[PDB]
């Protein structure tokens, strides 16, 4: 009596809801992983900052005195 299209569309809508739920789960785990990796990587900003500071320090130390060697 009811149009079969209605039933089949309800079924496929249920499938699409389930799939969206799975997508949400996956994206949540991805966000968790990204947060963890950034929190652990925070030390690399420190390391890069100090290395850059030292590089600039030696560069201007070779500038200040005339001890900067000629370009090979």
């Amino acid at each position: 009596m009811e149009n079969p299209h209605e039933q089949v569309q309800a079924n496929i809508l249920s499938r699409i809801i389930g799939n969206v739920k799975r997508l949400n789960e996956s994206v949540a785990i991805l966000n968790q992983e990204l947060v963890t990796i950034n929190n652990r990587n925070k030390n690399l900003e420190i390391m890069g900052a100090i290395c850059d500071n030292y590089h600039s320090s030696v560069q201007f130390n070779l500038e200040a005195t005339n001890n900067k060697k000629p370009p090979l």
Binding site: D52, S56, N61, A64
Partner: protein, 49 residues
């Protein structure tokens, strides 16, 4: 100009102060050597003469 480069400039001032102090120390030590080793012995030689 730049912020990293403005901290760099503060560090530049620090480096320049250090090197200028070193140059001043070297110059004063040279003056001391000249006074003690050269001028005074020549004054003594003139005294003997």
């Amino acid at each position: 100009m730049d912020s990293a480069s403005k901290e760099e400039t503060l560090e530049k001032l620090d480096q320049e102060i250090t090197v200028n102090l070193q140059k001043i120390d070297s110059n004063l030590s040279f003056c001391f050597h000249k006074i003690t080793q050269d001028i005074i012995p020549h004054v003594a030689t003139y005294s003997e003469i």
